[PDB]
Amino acid sequence: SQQVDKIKASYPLFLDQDYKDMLAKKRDGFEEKYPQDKIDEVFQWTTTKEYQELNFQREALTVNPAKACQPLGAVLCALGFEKTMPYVHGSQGCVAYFRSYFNRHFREPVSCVSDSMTEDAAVFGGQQNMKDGLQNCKATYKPDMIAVSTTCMAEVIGDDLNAFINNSKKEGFIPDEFPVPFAHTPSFVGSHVTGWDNMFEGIARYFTLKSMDDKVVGSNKKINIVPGFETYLGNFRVIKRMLSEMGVGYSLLSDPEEVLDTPADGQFRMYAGGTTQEEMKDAPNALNTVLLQPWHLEKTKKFVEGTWKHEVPKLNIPMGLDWTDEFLMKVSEISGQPIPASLTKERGRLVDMMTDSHTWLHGKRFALWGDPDFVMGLVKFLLELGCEPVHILCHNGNKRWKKAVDAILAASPYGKNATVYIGKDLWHLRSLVFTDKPDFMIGNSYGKFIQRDTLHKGKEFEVPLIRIGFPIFDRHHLHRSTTLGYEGAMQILTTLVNSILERLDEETRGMQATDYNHDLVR
Amino acid sequence: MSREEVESLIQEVLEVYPEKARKDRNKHLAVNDPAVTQSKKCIISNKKSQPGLMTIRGCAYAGSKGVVWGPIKDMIHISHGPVGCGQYSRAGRRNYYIGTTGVNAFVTMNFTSDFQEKDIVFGGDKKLAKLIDEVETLFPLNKGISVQSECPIGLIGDDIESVSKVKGAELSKTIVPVRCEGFRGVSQSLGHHIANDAVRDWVLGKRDEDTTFASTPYDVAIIGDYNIGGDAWSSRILLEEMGLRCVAQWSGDGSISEIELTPKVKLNLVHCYRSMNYISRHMEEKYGIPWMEYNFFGPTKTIESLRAIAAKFDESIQKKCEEVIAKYKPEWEAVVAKYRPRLEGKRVMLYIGGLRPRHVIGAYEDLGMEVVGTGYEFAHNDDYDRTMKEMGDSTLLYDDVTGYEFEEFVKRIKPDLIGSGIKEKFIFQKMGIPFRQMHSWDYSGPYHGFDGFAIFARDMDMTLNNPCWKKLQAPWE
Amino acid sequence: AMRQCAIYGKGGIGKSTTTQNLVAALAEMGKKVMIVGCDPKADSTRLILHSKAQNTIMEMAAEAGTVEDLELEDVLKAGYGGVKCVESGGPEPGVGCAGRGVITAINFLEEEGAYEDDLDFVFYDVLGDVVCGGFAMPIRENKAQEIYIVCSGEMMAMYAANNISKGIVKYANSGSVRLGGLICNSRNTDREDELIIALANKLGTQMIHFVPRDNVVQRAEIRRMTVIEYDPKAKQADEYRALARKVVDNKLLVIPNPITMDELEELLMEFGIMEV
Amino acid sequence: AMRQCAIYGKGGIGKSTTTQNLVAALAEMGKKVMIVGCDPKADSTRLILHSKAQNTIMEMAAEAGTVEDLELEDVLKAGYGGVKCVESGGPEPGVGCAGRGVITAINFLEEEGAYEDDLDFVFYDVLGDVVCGGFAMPIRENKAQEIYIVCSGEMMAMYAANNISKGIVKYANSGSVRLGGLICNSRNTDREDELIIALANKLGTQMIHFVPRDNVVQRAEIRRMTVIEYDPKAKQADEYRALARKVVDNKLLVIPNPITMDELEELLMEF
Numbered sequence A: 001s002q003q004v005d006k007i008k009a010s011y012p013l014f015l016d017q018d019y020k021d022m023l024a025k026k027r028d029g030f031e032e033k034y035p036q037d038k039i040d041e042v043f044q045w046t047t048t049k050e051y052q053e054l055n056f057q058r059e060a061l062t063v064n065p066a067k068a069c070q071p072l073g074a075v076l077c078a079l080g081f082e083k084t085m086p087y088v089h090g091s092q093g094c095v096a097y098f099r100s101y102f103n104r105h106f107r108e109p110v111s112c113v114s115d116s117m118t119e120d121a122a123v124f125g126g127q128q129n130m131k132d133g134l135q136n137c138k139a140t141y142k143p144d145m146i147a148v149s150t151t152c153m154a155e156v157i158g159d160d161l162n163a164f165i166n167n168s169k170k171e172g173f174i175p176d177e178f179p180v181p182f183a184h185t186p187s188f189v190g191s192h193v194t195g196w197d198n199m200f201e202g203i204a205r206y207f208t209l210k211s212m213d214d215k216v217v218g219s220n221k222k223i224n225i226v227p228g229f230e231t232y233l234g235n236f237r238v239i240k241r242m243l244s245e246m247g248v249g250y251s252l253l254s255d256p257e258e259v260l261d262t263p264a265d266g267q268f269r270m271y272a273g274g275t276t277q278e279e280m281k282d283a284p285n286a287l288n289t290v291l292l293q294p295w296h297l298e299k300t301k302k303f304v305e306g307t308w309k310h311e312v313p314k315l316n317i318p319m320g321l322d323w324t325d326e327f328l329m330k331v332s333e334i335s336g337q338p339i340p341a342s343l344t345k346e347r348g349r350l351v352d353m354m355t356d357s358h359t360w361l362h363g364k365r366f367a368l369w370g371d372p373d374f375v376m377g378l379v380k381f382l383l384e385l386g387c388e389p390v391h392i393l394c395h396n397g398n399k400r401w402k403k404a405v406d407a408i409l410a411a412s413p414y415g416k417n418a419t420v421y422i423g424k425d426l427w428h429l430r431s432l433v434f435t436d437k438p439d440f441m442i443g444n445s446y447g448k449f450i451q452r453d454t455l456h457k458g459k460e461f462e463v464p465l466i467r468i469g470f471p472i473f474d475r476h477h478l479h480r481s482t483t484l485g486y487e488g489a490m491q492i493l494t495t496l497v498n499s500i501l502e503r504l505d506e507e508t509r510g511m512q513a514t515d516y517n518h519d520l521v522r
Numbered sequence B: 001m002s003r004e005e006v007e008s009l010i011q012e013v014l015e016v017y018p019e020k021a022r023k024d025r026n027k028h029l030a031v032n033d034p035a036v037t038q039s040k041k042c043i044i045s046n047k048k049s050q051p052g053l054m055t056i057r058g059c060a061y062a063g064s065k066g067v068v069w070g071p072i073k074d075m076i077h078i079s080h081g082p083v084g085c086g087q088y089s090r091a092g093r094r095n096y097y098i099g100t101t102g103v104n105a106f107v108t109m110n111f112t113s114d115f116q117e118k119d120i121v122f123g124g125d126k127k128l129a130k131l132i133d134e135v136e137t138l139f140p141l142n143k144g145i146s147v148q149s150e151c152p153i154g155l156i157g158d159d160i161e162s163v164s165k166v167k168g169a170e171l172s173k174t175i176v177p178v179r180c181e182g183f184r185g186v187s188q189s190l191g192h193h194i195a196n197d198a199v200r201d202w203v204l205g206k207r208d209e210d211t212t213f214a215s216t217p218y219d220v221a222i223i224g225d226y227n228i229g230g231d232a233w234s235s236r237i238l239l240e241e242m243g244l245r246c247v248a249q250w251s252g253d254g255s256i257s258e259i260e261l262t263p264k265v266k267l268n269l270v271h272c273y274r275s276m277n278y279i280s281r282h283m284e285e286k287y288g289i290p291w292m293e294y295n296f297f298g299p300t301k302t303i304e305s306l307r308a309i310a311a312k313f314d315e316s317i318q319k320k321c322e323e324v325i326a327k328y329k330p331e332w333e334a335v336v337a338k339y340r341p342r343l344e345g346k347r348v349m350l351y352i353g354g355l356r357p358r359h360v361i362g363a364y365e366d367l368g369m370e371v372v373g374t375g376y377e378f379a380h381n382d383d384y385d386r387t388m389k390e391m392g393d394s395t396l397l398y399d400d401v402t403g404y405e406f407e408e409f410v411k412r413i414k415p416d417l418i419g420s421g422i423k424e425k426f427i428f429q430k431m432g433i434p435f436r437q438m439h440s441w442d443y444s445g446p447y448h449g450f451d452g453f454a455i456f457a458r459d460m461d462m463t464l465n466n467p468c469w470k471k472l473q474a475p476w477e
Numbered sequence C: 001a002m003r004q005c006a007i008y009g010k011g012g013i014g015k016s017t018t019t020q021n022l023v024a025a026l027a028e029m030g031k032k033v034m035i036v037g038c039d040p041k042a043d044s045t046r047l048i049l050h051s052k053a054q055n056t057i058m059e060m061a062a063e064a065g066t067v068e069d070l071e072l073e074d075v076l077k078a079g080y081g082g083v084k085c086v087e088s089g090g091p092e093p094g095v096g097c098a099g100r101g102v103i104t105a106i107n108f109l110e111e112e113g114a115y116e117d118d119l120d121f122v123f124y125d126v127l128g129d130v131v132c133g134g135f136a137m138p139i140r141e142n143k144a145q146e147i148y149i150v151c152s153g154e155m156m157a158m159y160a161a162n163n164i165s166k167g168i169v170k171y172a173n174s175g176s177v178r179l180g181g182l183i184c185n186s187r188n189t190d191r192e193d194e195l196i197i198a199l200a201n202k203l204g205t206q207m208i209h210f211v212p213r214d215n216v217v218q219r220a221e222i223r224r225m226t227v228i229e230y231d232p233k234a235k236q237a238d239e240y241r242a243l244a245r246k247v248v249d250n251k252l253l254v255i256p257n258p259i260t261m262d263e264l265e266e267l268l269m270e271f272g273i274m275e276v
Numbered sequence D: 001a002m003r004q005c006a007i008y009g010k011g012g013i014g015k016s017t018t019t020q021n022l023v024a025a026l027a028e029m030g031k032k033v034m035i036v037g038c039d040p041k042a043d044s045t046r047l048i049l050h051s052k053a054q055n056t057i058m059e060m061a062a063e064a065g066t067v068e069d070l071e072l073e074d075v076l077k078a079g080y081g082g083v084k085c086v087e088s089g090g091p092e093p094g095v096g097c098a099g100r101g102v103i104t105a106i107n108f109l110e111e112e113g114a115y116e117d118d119l120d121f122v123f124y125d126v127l128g129d130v131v132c133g134g135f136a137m138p139i140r141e142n143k144a145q146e147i148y149i150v151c152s153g154e155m156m157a158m159y160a161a162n163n164i165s166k167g168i169v170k171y172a173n174s175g176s177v178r179l180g181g182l183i184c185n186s187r188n189t190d191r192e193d194e195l196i197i198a199l200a201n202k203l204g205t206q207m208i209h210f211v212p213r214d215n216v217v218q219r220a221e222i223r224r225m226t227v228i229e230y231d232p233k234a235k236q237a238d239e240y241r242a243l244a245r246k247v248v249d250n251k252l253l254v255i256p257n258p259i260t261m262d263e264l265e266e267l268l269m270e271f
């Protein structure tokens, strides 16, 4: 039943006695459910070190992965170019998922097409789909560029993108000069970040490979910036802001910041902003190229060093205090521009915040996960704050990255209780936060189910989730935040210390029990 | 509005396409005639999508794992193949359930074989066997396993039926291999069919020679309600208040034992015809169990359904039916009194999957609203047959609509409200058109049944009449 | 009582010729036979139908829209002696996925009930190299129960036989499929019959028959027929009748025991390969 | 100016043997050569290496878990005349996806700079049953620019030539790969040389060399050697040097015009 003036949605509607009664009857009557005592016993077992050993012996099963597949990243890369339509050669189910996944994180339209290869295209190849698809997409959505990647079915059968695209042109399905860069993006290799690297290198190659002869390093006096897979709008924005503040000429290669944040003013804008084709064509004339997320930009780096002949600086992601300092000094060195008083002051304001909050941060223990560059930047900044990373997970990390993070941990007395996991998932991480409980988790929305599991053991075992990363689906507008630079470090620091204080208030809110420590001033 | 004008709009919008696509899309767009009984004379459906036109459709895996099998709560469902498909589909659909997740229920979890390149090249049957051992080790209370194929499994010829049989026997477990590789068929729809057949072949006959279940004459099953935001629960409560016993619901909050008990019921109540008519026909052919379509969207359809269902039984049930209808009458009348004056005359366009585009029309009409365009991603012509009589004359019908078409149609028809999916939502909000998600219920619901109608009405009003929609134009422009 | 057989062996060793002549001989003695072509070249039923074509399952699926729109009547055709013929179809070389074509085709035949039980034999004619799971579709459970491997007394043909047996062991142990023997399609090599008989023993099987190299085969082939239809009383026609009878009466069905490369080299050396 | 070449032809026609014997002769001349085996049975370099075990890219990847963990010097070996040998590898028959194995292996070689170093030649040795896109990996842009098709005077072998040429066309029209010639690996048929010369012209290419049938080829193979290594002064060894010289000096690179199965039947009757 409903009271018309206080209508109940599913929660708390189904807490009503008649629904509870009906659900009890359904369970007991027909579900043949294990008895509750058996369920409790198994749950308790899944929190143990014995279960953890079984859990970490897994060789074949993955449970709750913390990665996605290549073409997701290719699509995001392609969205960063002016009037460019991402186009995924292969099966259309993929594209419905890519668009939805991004819709939910950015709360924005995400435009991408498929050429809808079906069973007979698997068998005969997708050449005809590419021909009709390119002509159709061009006629209908009028992009200036189509950026082609692949789904796994087209990768198994070896559809030759290059050949298929050139035959579409030779047979007049699309104009010969119409830009159609491409990249093979097999989902059974690496992860979504690998797809971003592959797509970018494909686009870079398409615009520069054949015209290197008239290029001269340094002649346009700019620095190229390659952001990598990035889902915080604030991160594109803060890099542009700091470089402009320094008076450094720059070119951000793949810049989806406008198309992922169009105004609601009465019109739908399928495209907005982005890196121009002229910017890509002119990129070899830059002083140098900086890669913001080097641990998934290795193919790009090979191309940029070997073909554009840029001496790509060996720089970590600009996260936290030290690595933002190093980023600015290297940009200063490359461009000849001094670091301006305004950025020096910003730095000092982050340091001020660190001094102001250090007592609540000291010794706090974290589990965390995400992509390799993001995770290592977060680990580095946690150490700067006097926090203890304890469980560091990167499902899509590799052995060289893991050794690099171990070295960062070893360089700080706050890294002594930390372990780095690669190729492990969030079901592994679940065991870890039970057997070696941290104070908080820092991760994406998938972490909410771990928090739920830990609370069921008991309030004193609950590990609250702090949402930083991708995807974030169960809060609104966090994609607008910043994690890079001094600005991102300030946002992260604020989120951490106030997560700590929020939990302490919750734990001290008990009238005449714990509220002796419910201080007004912290 | 006006038949010649709608036909004019269709031809104008079609002008942008190359000839091949233009010729095809022409067959998938129609101006309704409620008179017409054979929709094949008016619209074509369930055909392959044109390449590069931004279809809204998904794949057979979505139709099998995402829709039919995924909701079954005490089984573990393996997304078999690379990591992508299971991750994008993890907990995206609100098929609600009661359980202890990770212990006796597993719906929100993502199990996968995470195929790597060596698995493609050397095949994944050995990995799948080992994966099944590890599932049994770490999740001992699971009551069965399904193996949901992604694209590569279908190409490379892995023998998942043999693996399911051998491991099934070795562990005395029901293991269900499903060939729902995403390039099969043309949409989610063939996934429904493949999944229904897998239930038929591997699960449904398990209790064929068991007589220990005590059946009654009032035993029914809810077929094809996936309990979105609790939809099936707010339907099941009405059937049971009417004196019927709901032995199973397929597959929202469903359990494998409910599925196995379903051949013992007296009548199959089918809500989603599209996804479950296959197993419904099977059950009538093998078990002799009749089935009937019903509609619990809004009071008019719910009331009509309750009486139709009750007439299938005896006088005692028909008496209880009228008593249920009497109980809820002042509740939905208060909903109408409150919200119908706020919504009267407003015009809605819908685009959804294979059922809701016709099924929710009655509910909109109970609020005095008018559905001026509707269409489906993956319906067949027997769906459009049921749609044309539900829609007004000279309303617009569109099958497998393109992103471009849908936008152009909306610009000319200018609905007050649009009901579609997440990939449509943010496009139309930017055009200043109130939008309701009619797959996820926009994280609201239930919408089925009497209790659901109150929420549906509240939601339509909250969005259509929200103060944000007056604010899109800057005053200085 | 319906027997399903799959024919394997190196490309160009003579699988399709031997299979169709064998099948014609079988029909000629009154057997009801279906041939399922599992080779994307799609020439496995040419000699039975007369004309060099037959519309394939995959191309008819592409014509009709999807496989779901396909009717059995459109792709299953009768030829010599009422034998039923069907081709999987597949791509031209170097594009697409021939393996999936075989998977799709065989699932379709199963689903549409082409295995009627008005059949005494089903023969699958399979691609030489067997480079993926799809080309093992014919020897999964409830498909072919007997495998015959065509080879000859040449090194390359015998290695292929041995390599194919490696792949067989997996399906023989998961299911019920067995190796019924080696068919020696002669290349007129020295001591060819003893050499194949010896390889057969190593594997644990038999040489079920020795087929002579006869240019009456090339004659019938350009005439697009089997030898059985072309010249019923050629000596080569009697050879296929002999092979046909042996297959019908065969009871030797084993799990093969593949040998090593060193073993195969030693065997050929035993039979004079290094002699000039 | 490294020249990349791919060898195709009817199953069993002599692709691998011809390729290795050719390459031995090139190396004997002082050419630096790499052979890339593109066949899951991994028998493309057996006659060049023949000493010590060869490990394939796919096998080594499986052991290491992924291709990224693999190093080029683990799978790339030098044999007779310093010819560098590498095998894609792949599954045993009837399981997995050998096509993808070839894609993966050639991608690896490209990424790890195999095509650096100053090679004069790279040869891809492919299997006879080119059943998918993966087995045409060797003729994509930036791979083989020259195709040699091994055939003979037998019908099946000419039909294979034509049908392979058919498959070549979509890559030739879209890139720079071209047919370089037919290699007649003789089956001692009547007027074989004239007949293959004839097929060459219908296609628009040439018969670059007629290789006699000589059982010394098989005796060398049994010893796991090329004729060049096994018996450097044999008549057949001279044939391969002759073949190698033509390949070195060849400039004829064309797009194939496949003919009807009817024209082929015309050819074979008229001879």
Ligand SMILES: Nc1ncnc2c1ncn2[C@@H]1O[C@H](COP(=O)(O)OP(=O)(O)CP(=O)(O)O)[C@@H](O)[C@H]1O
Residues within 6 Å of the ligand: C155, C156, D009, D010, D011, D012, D013, D014, D015, D016, D017, D018, D039, D126, D127, D128, D129, D185, D186, D211, D212, D213, D214, D215, D216, D217, D218, D221
């Ligand atoms: N000129 C010649 N004279 C005699 N025998 C020859 C020959 N050339 C090749 N052969 C023999 O023919 C057999 C097959 O040779 P090879 O293995 O090179 O063919 P292929 O590479 O085309 C087989 P596949 O199609 O499976 O890849 C080998 O035993 C080889 O020794």
Ligand SMILES: Nc1ncnc2c1ncn2[C@@H]1O[C@H](COP(=O)(O)OP(=O)(O)O)[C@@H](O)[C@H]1O
Residues within 6 Å of the ligand: C009, C010, C011, C012, C013, C014, C015, C016, C017, C018, C185, C186, C211, C212, C213, C214, C215, C217, C218, C221, D155, D156
């Ligand atoms: N017994 C035989 N005598 C002479 N020629 C034969 C004989 N068997 C087959 N051939 C010829 O050898 C060639 C290849 O035979 P085919 O059956 O197509 O091989 P596969 O089926 O193994 O690819 C055909 O031209 C065929 O006419």
Ligand code: ICS
Residues within 6 Å of the ligand: B063, B067, B093, B188, B224, B226, B228, B272, B273, B274, B275, B352, B353, B354, B355, B356, B357, B438, B439, B440
């Ligand atoms: S199953 Fe179908 S697309 Fe009948 S695949 Fe889809 S939870 Fe839709 S219109 Mo999402 S045939 Fe259900 C559907 Fe309807 S996922 Fe839900 S809303 S009533």
Ligand code: CLF
Residues within 6 Å of the ligand: A069, A070, A071, A091, A092, A093, A094, A095, A097, A150, A151, A152, A153, A187, B059, B060, B061, B062, B081, B082, B083, B084, B085, B086, B149, B150, B151, B180, B181, B182, B183
């Ligand atoms: S139709 Fe999957 S999302 Fe794709 S590229 Fe493969 S891992 Fe990634 Fe359907 S079954 Fe799935 S969702 Fe597509 S792949 Fe096919």
Ligand code: SF4
Residues within 6 Å of the ligand: A156, A157, A158, B155, B156, B157, C096, C097, C098, C099, C100, C131, C132, C133, C134, D096, D097, D098, D099, D100, D131, D132, D133, D134
């Ligand atoms: S090897 Fe088999 S499965 Fe793999 S692509 Fe080639 S044909 Fe298809």
Ligand SMILES: [Fe+3]
Residues within 6 Å of the ligand: A106, A107, A108, B426
């Ligand atoms: Fe938004």
Ligand SMILES: [Mg+2]
Residues within 6 Å of the ligand: C015, C016, C017, C039, C043, C044, C125
């Ligand atoms: Mg054949």
Ligand SMILES: [Mg+2]
Residues within 6 Å of the ligand: D015, D016, D017, D039, D043, D125, D126, D127
């Ligand atoms: Mg070979």
